[PDB]
Write a protein that binds this ligand. Structure first.
Ligand code: CLA
Ligand code: CLA
Ligand code: CLA
Ligand code: CLA
Ligand code: CLA
Ligand code: CLA
Ligand code: CLA
Ligand code: CLA
Ligand code: CLA
Ligand code: LHG
Lengths: 721, 66, 151, 40, 73, 146
């Protein structure tokens, strides 16, 4: 263990090697010095930023030299977005497929092509520069971490000034960041894209900087720019309304949100974050003591409340990390459900392959981060919770009636589980016995989601009534009778909600509640329990406390994250499935000359997603045919990864269904065979630890499982869309 | 432009002036509305010549919208 | 509190960086009048091109300047240099002897007026910047035009 | 300078070794691709 | 499982008078999952349909039943 | 044989403990330390030497194009004989590596000139690559104008 001297000491077993990586980032276990830790993590963030910066550089670089972005620009409707090319070795070249534009490459789903068009990027020259600028930044970030750990590391007092940090981050980064981007839009994005929508061709577009210098070129369209003095200083602001609007809805030619709206959006967001930035107290008087305000809230129910919080969230990283992970993950989820319903990029909605993979990617990232909040919340209870020095009282009570919260949450899951999954087992049984009248269906006993249907109804009648400035709807899923069709593809359409939609939402209610149960139970009972009164002394990550008390396996808070990790998989895995089928069945499709719309699966969602057999046949078995028939084509890799994931998955069950006692005894026989032939390693081979075997197990389970759909989805939408 | 200009540029500099009146307070030295308006209100008030031209353009923007 | 340091220090807090402030007191000075010199010596009687490309001069602008401005640090970092006739016995803040002929003359402070000439020439030459930039016309056009139509 | 060498002598050694091995194998396959047998 | 898979597939290809499909698809694992697992499931999983109900409805239900007990373990 | 006086590359200061000017040509250069082990240096030394000796000759190849302003069996044999010959040559040199105050001057000077050819021999080609033009004339042919 490099980090610690005794840890580094010497290796006698192979366990040392596994431990070395397991506690590599466990900074608070290497020192008790808070300042040393804080200094460590601060530099670590720099090293992170460098990697993602380098990551961005490669995306821009590949877009420049190894992509057909220019080719896609002239003909976005039926050119397939492709970056990265494969060298012709051991038969690889088959992965290079027809993507249009006289180019051989792998079709991509990151969506950079749609991003770049929105930014008004037109040439590889421009992409080439942005790649270098990113590399230059990557060099800075990496250097910056070295400088703030070996040359000039900040005091603990520096990090503790949370007020000053808050003011900046939601103003200096958010506000000006939104404002700065707002400027690029109306000066570069909006002018250039306006040309692109007129079929002018990229090379026939003037360079972005010519729009900024002379107003002439930018003023002929959006004639508010004509006045040099500008009506801004007149503070009338009504004149500006040509380049920015509150039109909403969707452009019928590009299928994305009007940049005419996004610019206005950021303009508002910017100063809204600039004003909200002027809140907390610093040095020049004006502002708030968050310590003071927090103290003020108290209650007949809470007694003292929030008192002492400021002390906790200024001396414990795991406390801050849990909160941030809980919402950053939650934010990623609402991002997924806002980009599908309100396509913000040109020719994004039309590109079905990108949309499925974008929504699905954000759902997992959001799902994982939330699970991580459970871990560090539990780590805080084990390592940083001290009532003697930092009592809160809010935390108390919670611990006081913890057997109550879990017991109730236990019940809700059983109620939800029955009233969700049971309905399906009902329908599966009534249909098998030949009685569809009996089933919970739109054709039989229907359970209409009238509440969701009512909220959508008011969103439709919103423009003009409760939203005068809004000419059109927010999203066309709330439209009513509107239909956008970019190319021969359908960008968006009002999404109906039936009894089949009532069931699946109740499954998400369920899966989320159970996931919450497992994780929350591990956080509250992390220190003490009737079973184990001194669990906190065993630590956060320990396998057990023996077979005693009937058996105390996975009593650790670590193991609660372990169990809740599978459930977060079970959860999302069915959200993305809901997304895939519903969009294919009732939204995505081709529109004809007459106006008749044919969907990919043809509206079979409403009466076939109410059955379990229906998902197993009309969804899995049906939509798999692509992946399992992708051999000999450009999507060959997806077919292999589909098989490859099924293996790393079943490979996990080996670790999950067994224990290390068997394996260690097996190794004994194998070490003997080695000692016979002088080939016994001085570093004695040991089996994985009880806890590691669980860690190894869940990783491969998630990998094989997640990866397996990845290949599922990406083979499906590409071959069909 | 001319006089008209200088009259809007002075009322976009007097859009400022009205949130001077919130809080203006006065009562100097008696009663206390000043000391009270210099107690919690204001920790100076050309920080509110500055808080002026910020929110004032907003108040006009909203008073037309409200 | 922008002013108060307390650093080791990676140089944002301690004494230098106001040291530089002292010395850009001088080439914002030589830079200014040295830039108006071609401007109004022609008063009596945008790429723009001179000789070759002036990136080549650069290599010789950052060459000699290198061989020059380099050493200067050396003194700072540590009194002696010692390579050439070269003497630099003066203190790191200033080394008047040997490159100022016959004079030797600093205390009034003048230095306080040379840093005063300093950061007014900073804003004088910081004038020149934003001046001829966001407008589109040079510093002497709008200035002449500004006493022309004040209001 | 003793230090850099050791540094290159840990599991990294494995990557360098397997990179060198891969390069050898791939290049062999370039010169002799689609090899189902040893015919000499 | 491997024994019974191997016995059944080689016979149902023989019974259909098409041993050619087995001889070519059994040499790679995608063949097993597609030409054996996927291919013979169609009539099974349509034991009961949102349109009709066959005599194979028992087996379609038990098929899902077996999945449920399995995952419960 | 130690002295703080050696003309360092970077004046005030430049003292790596490994370098000391005991060696000839010691201008105090090695931030990287590319040889802080005596096994490290003793090898680098020989390495930095043989190179130079060769580079000189390479220079003696720049001497021939100004005298005038390639085989009887191209490569192949010409190399094997070379390999077979310089082999044995370099062979023994290898075995030797692992098994007057006046002379210091000579050797200090030898390295520096030698250092020159390498920088030289180098220069003539990374000026020749990408830029198809000989250096033969350039001294006063490019001196006509930058
Ligand atoms: C410039 C070269 C340089 C050198 C010679 C050192 C040397 C040292 N560092 Mg510093 N460091 C550097 C740059 C450097 N560092 C930079 C640029 C940063 C900012 C991120 C840091 C941040 C840092 C911290 C926080 C710490 C050190 C520490 C140390 C000391 C122990 C080394 C160690 O941590 O163990 C291991 C050596 C490694 C190289 C570990 C690998 C980490 C790298 C970054 C992985 C790269 C990411 C990788 C690409 C991820 C993708 C993997 C993928 C293939 C799967 C050692 C003296 C530690 C110390 O002082 O001891 C108490 C310590 O706490 N360094
Ligand atoms: C906000 C981001 C964040 C940060 C800064 C941390 C930071 C930390 N975590 Mg945490 N964690 C997070 C998010 C985060 N976590 C989330 C979202 C989860 C839920 C999954 C967790 C779950 C978790 C657990 C269970 C534990 C930690 C622990 C820790 C601490 C040290 C552990 C370590 O060194 O890593 C070690 C790194 C490894 C062992 C590498 C493992 C190999 C990875 C998992 C494979 C990834 C597969 C790859 C992506 C795809 C395949 C590639 C391959 C085929 C080549 C450290 C303070 C440990 C602790 O005790 O806290 C002090 C601890 O046990 N975390
Ligand atoms: C960090 C993210 C990232 C990822 C995942 C990739 C991935 C890849 N790159 Mg890119 N690259 C990146 C960043 C990245 N690169 C950046 C920031 C730059 C700018 C310097 C480049 C410049 C670049 C070039 C010039 C090339 C690639 C190539 C490749 C492909 C061949 C792998 C290879 O290099 O051979 C092995 C690498 C080594 C042996 C050296 C280590 C592979 C898909 C090649 C390609 O696209 O094939 C046609 C190619 O020629 N990359
Ligand atoms: C107002 C200006 C400003 C800006 C733009 C940032 C930006 C950032 N901060 Mg800093 N911070 C600020 C003020 C600011 N901070 C002040 C005044 C303090 C003292 C209280 C801090 C204390 C602080 C800490 C302790 C940490 C950060 C971290 C971060 C990074 C988090 C990544 C992110 O948010 O997304 C987006 C990232 C970018 C858009 C990259 C921006 C490129 C550079 C950094 C901007 C340089 C500004 C330039 C002159 C314009 C990000 C680079 C975290 C970090 O990552 O550690 C290194 C971190 O832990 N900040
Ligand atoms: C309770 C639900 C609800 C919600 C979420 C909204 C939301 C909104 N309204 Mg509506 N409004 C509502 C009820 C609601 N309103 C009712 C019941 C009435 C009748 C009295 C109105 C009458 C109304 C008017 C006249 C206007 C808005 C406007 C707005 C928008 C801007 C609000 C603002 O200026 O700053 C926060 C915002 C989308 C403005 C707008 O249309 O934006 C362009 C606008 O001028 N609303
Ligand atoms: C698909 C899942 C799976 C796989 C692949 C295995 C594989 C194996 N099991 Mg296992 N097992 C499983 C599930 C699985 N099991 C389950 C669900 C249970 C019930 C709990 C068990 C219970 C069990 C018991 C009780 C035993 C085994 C044993 C074995 C080994 C038998 C040796 C052998 O035939 O081939 C050798 C190995 C393989 C065929 C697979 C190795 C994987 C690949 C081929 C290695 C190549 C790596 C490649 C380079 C990728 C690199 C990755 C990169 C990130 C570096 C073999 C490793 C026995 C054993 O340990 O014998 C020594 C044994 O005692 N298994
Ligand atoms: C502080 C040091 C310094 C000094 C002493 C100078 C001095 C000079 N500069 Mg430089 N400059 C400097 C710093 C300095 N500069 C810096 C820091 C920059 C970067 C911003 C520049 C950028 C710069 C540019 C771009 C140019 C100069 C030019 C000049 C020359 C002016 C010639 C001219 O066209 O204007 C006016 C004309 C005259 C002064 C000629 C006077 C002629 C008199 C009136 C007699 C006329 C009779 C006629 C010649 C017949 C001959 C009869 C004979 C017997 C007299 C002059 C030698 C110009 C140049 O290089 O010349 C080609 C020029 O274009 N400078
Ligand atoms: C498909 C297999 C399966 C099933 C059915 C369940 C079911 C359940 N799990 Mg489990 N789980 C599983 C696999 C499964 N899990 C796996 C593989 C893992 C590893 C991660 C876990 C990890 C796990 C954890 C950590 C937890 C659960 C919990 C629960 C319970 C949530 C409460 C509930 O919904 O009750 C309702 C029951 C059902 C929905 C099952 C079907 C009910 C049938 C259709 C109705 C009854 C039929 C009929 C009347 C029987 C009579 C016939 C007669 C002849 C007997 C529920 C019993 C949680 C719990 O304890 O409750 C909160 C909990 O904490 N699970
Ligand atoms: C038995 C097999 C055998 C082999 C493989 C060698 C190999 C070698 N001998 Mg040796 N030698 C041998 C037997 C052998 N010898 C016998 C029986 C004697 C008599 C005792 C000698 C006496 C001898 C002497 C005196 C020398 C060698 C030397 C050498 C090396 C010269 C390399 C070279 O440049 O030539 C050609 C290079 C390539 C083809 C490449 C080479 C490693 C020379 C040496 O030591 O170099 C350092 C040397 O001087 N040998
Ligand atoms: C039929 C449709 C009509 C809807 C009504 C029923 C649906 C809503 C469920 C009623 C819950 C009552 C909330 C009272 C509002 C409320 O929460 O009061 C909050 C109350 C206020 O305490 P204080 O006044 O002290 O708060 C201030 C200080 O305590 C803090 O500084 O605190 C408590 O109640 C303590 C005990 C917790 C109570 C636990 C009950 C939790 C309910 C769990 C269900 C969550 C549902 C969320 C869905 C989005």
């Amino acid at each position: 263990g490099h980090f610690s001297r005794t840890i580094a000491k010497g290796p006698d077993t192979t366990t040392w090697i596994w431990n070395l990586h397991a506690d590599a980032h466990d900074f608070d276990s290497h020192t008790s010095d808070l300042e040393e830790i804080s200094r460590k993590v601060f530099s670590a963030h720099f090293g992170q930023l460098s990697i993602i910066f380098l990551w961005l550089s490669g995306m821009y670089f590949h877009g420049a030299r190894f992509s057909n972005y220019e080719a896609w620009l002239n003909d976005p409707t039926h050119i397939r977005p492709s970056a990265q090319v494969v060298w012709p070795i051991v038969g690889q070249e088959i992965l290079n497929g027809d993507v249009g534009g006289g180019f051989r490459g792998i079709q991509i789903t990151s969506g950079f092509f749609q991003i770049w068009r929105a930014s008004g990027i037109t040439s590889e020259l421009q992409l080439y520069c942005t790649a270098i600028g990113a590399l230059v930044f990557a060099g800075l970030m990496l250097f910056a971490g070295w400088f703030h750990y070996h040359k000039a590391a900040p005091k603990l007092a520096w990090f503790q000034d949370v007020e000053s940090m808050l003011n900046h981050h939601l103003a200096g980064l958010l506000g000006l960041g939104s404002l700065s981007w707002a400027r690029h839009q109306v000066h570069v994005s909006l002018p250039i894209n306006q040309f692109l929508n007129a079929g002018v061709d990229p090379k026939e577009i003037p360079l972005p900087h010519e729009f900024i210098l002379n107003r002439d070129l930018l003023a002929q369209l959006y004639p508010s720019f004509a006045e040099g003095a500008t009506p801004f200083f007149t503070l009338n602001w009504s004149k500006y309304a040509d380049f920015l609007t509150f039109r909403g809805g969707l452009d019928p030619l590009t299928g994305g949100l009007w940049l005419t709206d996004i610019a206005h959006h950021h303009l508002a967001i910017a100063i809204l974050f600039l004003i909200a930035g002027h809140m907390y107290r610093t040095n020049w008087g004006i502002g708030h003591g968050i310590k003071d305000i927090l103290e003020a809230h108290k209650g007949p129910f809470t007694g003292q409340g929030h008192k002492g919080l400021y002390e906790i969230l200024t001396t414990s990283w795991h406390a801050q990390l849990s909160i941030n992970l809980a919402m950053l993950g939650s934010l990623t989820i609402v991002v997924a459900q806002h980009m599908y319903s309100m396509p913000p990029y040109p020719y994004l909605a039309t590109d079905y392959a990108t949309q499925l993979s974008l929504f699905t990617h954000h759902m997992w990232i959001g799902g994982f981060l939330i699970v991580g909040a459970a871990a560090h919340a539990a780590i805080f209870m084990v390592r940083d919770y001290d009532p003697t020095t930092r009592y809160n009282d809010l935390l108390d009570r919670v611990l006081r009636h913890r057997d109550a919260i879990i017991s109730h949450l236990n019940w809700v899951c059983i109620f939800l589980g029955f009233h969700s999954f049971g309905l399906y087992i009902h329908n599966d049984t009534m249909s098998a016995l030949g009685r569809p009248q009996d089933m919970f269906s739109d054709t039989a006993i229907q359970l209409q989601p009238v509440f969701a249907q009512w909220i959508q109804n008011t969103h439709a009648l919103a423009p003009g009534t409760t939203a005068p400035g809004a000419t059109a709807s927010t999203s066309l899923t709330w439209g009513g009778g509107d239909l956008v069709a970019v190319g021969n593809k359908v960008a968006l359409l009002p999404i109906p909600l039936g009894t089949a939609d009532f069931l699946v939402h109740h499954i998400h209610a369920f899966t989320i509640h159970v996931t919450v149960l497992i994780l929350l139970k591990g956080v509250l009972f992390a220190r003490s329990s009737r079973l184990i009164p001194d669990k906190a002394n065993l630590g956060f990550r320990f396998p057990c406390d023996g077979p005693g008390r009937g058996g105390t396996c996975q009593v650790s808070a670590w193991d609660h994250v372990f169990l809740g990790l599978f459930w977060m998989y079970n959860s999302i895995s069915v959200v993305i499935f809901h997304f895939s089928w519903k969009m294919q069945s009732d939204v995505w499709g081709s529109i004809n000359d007459q106006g008749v719309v044919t969907h990919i699966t043809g509206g079979n969602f409403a009466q076939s997603s109410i059955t379990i057999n229906g998902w197993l046949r009309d969804f899995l078995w049906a939509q798999a045919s692509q992946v399992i028939q992708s051999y000999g084509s450009s999507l060959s890799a997806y077919g292999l990864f589909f098989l490859g994931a099924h293996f790393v998955w079943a490979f996990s069950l080996m670790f999950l269904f067994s224990g290390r006692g068997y394996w260690q005894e097996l190794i004994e026989s194998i070490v003997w065979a080695h000692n016979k032939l002088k080939v016994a390693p001085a570093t004695q081979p040991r089996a994985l630890s009880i806890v590691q075997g669980r860690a190894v197990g869940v990783t491969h389970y998630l990998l094989g499982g997640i990866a397996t759909t990845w290949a599922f989805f990406l083979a499906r939408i590409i071959a069909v869309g | 432009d001319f006089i008209g200009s200088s009259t809007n540029v002075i009322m976009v500099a007097s859009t400022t002036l009205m949130l001077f009146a919130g809080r203006f307070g006065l009562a100097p030295s008696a009663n206390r509305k000043a000391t009270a308006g210099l107690k919690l209100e204001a920790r100076g008030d050309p920080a509110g010549f500055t808080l002026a031209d910020t929110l004032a353009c907003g108040t006009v923007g909203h008073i037309i919208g409200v | 509190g922008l002013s108060d340091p307390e650093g080791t220090g990676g140089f944002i807090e301690p004494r230098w960086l106001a040291y530089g402030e002292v010395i850009n007191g001088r080439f914002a000075m030589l830079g200014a009048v040295g830039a108006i010199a071609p401007e109004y010596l022609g008063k009596v009687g945008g790429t723009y091109n001179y000789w070759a490309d002036n990136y080549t001069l650069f290599v010789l602008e950052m060459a000699l300047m290198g061989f020059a401005e380099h050493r200067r640090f050396q003194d700072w970092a540590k009194p002696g240099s010692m390579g050439k006739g070269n003497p630099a016995y003066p203190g790191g803040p200033f080394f008047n002897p040997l490159g100022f002929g016959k004079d030797e003359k600093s205390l009034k402070e003048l230095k306080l007026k040379e840093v005063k000439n300093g950061r007014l020439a900073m804003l004088a030459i910081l004038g020149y910047f934003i001046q001829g930039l966001v407008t589109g016309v040079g510093p002497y056009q709008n200035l002449l035009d500004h006493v022309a139509d004040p209001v | 300078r003793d230090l850099k060498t050791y540094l290159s002598v840990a599991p990294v050694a494995s990557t360098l070794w397997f990179a060198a091995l891969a390069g050898l194998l791939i290049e062999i396959n370039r010169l002799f691709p689609d090899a189902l047998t040893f015919p000499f | 499982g491997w024994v019974t898979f191997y016995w059944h597939w080689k016979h149902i290809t023989l019974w259909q008078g098409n041993v050619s499909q087995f001889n070519e698809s059994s040499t790679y694992l995608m063949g097993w999952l597609r030409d054996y697992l996927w291919l013979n499931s169609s009539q099974l999983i349509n034991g009961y349909t949102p349109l009709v109900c066959n005599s194979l409805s028992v087996w379609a239900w038990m098929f899902l039943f077996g999945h449920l007990v399995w995952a419960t373990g | 044989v130690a002295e703080p006086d050696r003309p360092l590359w970077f004046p005030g200061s430049t003292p790596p403990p490994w370098l000391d000017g005991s060696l000839p040509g010691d201008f105090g250069f090695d931030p990287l330390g590319l040889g802080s082990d005596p096994e490290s240096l003793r090898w680098n030394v020989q390495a930095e030497l043989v190179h130079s000796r060769w580079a000189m000759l390479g220079a003696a190849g720049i001497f021939i194009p100004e005298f005038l302003t390639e085989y009887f069996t191209d490569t192949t044999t010409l190399f094997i004989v070379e390999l077979v010959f310089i082999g044995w040559a370099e062979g023994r040199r290898w075995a030797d590596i692992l098994n007057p105050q006046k002379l210091k001057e000579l050797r200090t000077k030898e390295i520096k000139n030698g250092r020159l050819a390498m920088l030289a021999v180098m220069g003539a080609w990374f000026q020749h690559i990408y830029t198809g033009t000989g250096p033969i004339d350039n001294l006063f042919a490019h001196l006509a104008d930058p």
